[PDB]
Amino acid sequence: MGRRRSHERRDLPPNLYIRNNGYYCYRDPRTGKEFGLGRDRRIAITEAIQANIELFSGHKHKPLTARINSDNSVTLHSWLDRYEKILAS
DNA sequence: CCGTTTCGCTCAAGTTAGTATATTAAAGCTGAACGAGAAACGTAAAATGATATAAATATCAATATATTAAATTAGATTTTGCATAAAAAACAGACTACATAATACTGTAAAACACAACATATGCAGTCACTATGCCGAC
């Protein structure tokens, strides 16, 4: 992979970059080069967004096996089970 | 004696009957840590119980007679409780004199930055290689 995922990519489209000088670039699916898009975040992002298309349903993440995860997991039944206990008190 | 069916029971999902509180305000309860003076104890030293026997000293009744400590007065006086009042010193109530800050006003250097023509390294702009398995193709 070489770079894998990084931290700045966490909030940037697939074909988008982010140099050291807070600048963003536009990758090219022909040779691998890139150009200069914008200085802002949502601006450079939206640009790469309208380039190919938006994200998807959720998140990709597909290395080789798996790793730690700490996302959202709200549920009604789960709450209800905790509610029945509070009632007994 | 034993099996079979009805009946007493409790679990599970609808159908009704009843009563109504939150903050202020000020305590009251109780586990746990905090800080000295007096007497029961105990080993050690001083006074006393132990112990006995012929000789020395005290035990005491019954009454005369000189002696004396000391409570009982009785009058004398330091001692003790309580102010009164003025000489003497403290200290606000005045006031000008004196040295000192806040302020009144003039005199002068210079901080702080816009404005404007250049000068140019450096970040950004644009393209190819570095570095190593995908994908696609065979096994």
Swiss-Prot record:
Name of the molecule in the record: Integrase
Similarity-based family: Belongs to the 'phage' integrase family.
Role summary: Integrase is necessary for integration of the phage into the host genome by site-specific recombination. In conjunction with excisionase, integrase is also necessary for excision of the prophage from the host genome.
Source organism superkingdom: Viruses
Gene name per UniProt: int
SUBUNIT field: Homotetramer. Interacts (via N-terminus) with the excisionase (via C-terminus). Part of the excision complex made of the integrase tetramer, IHF, Fis and Xis.
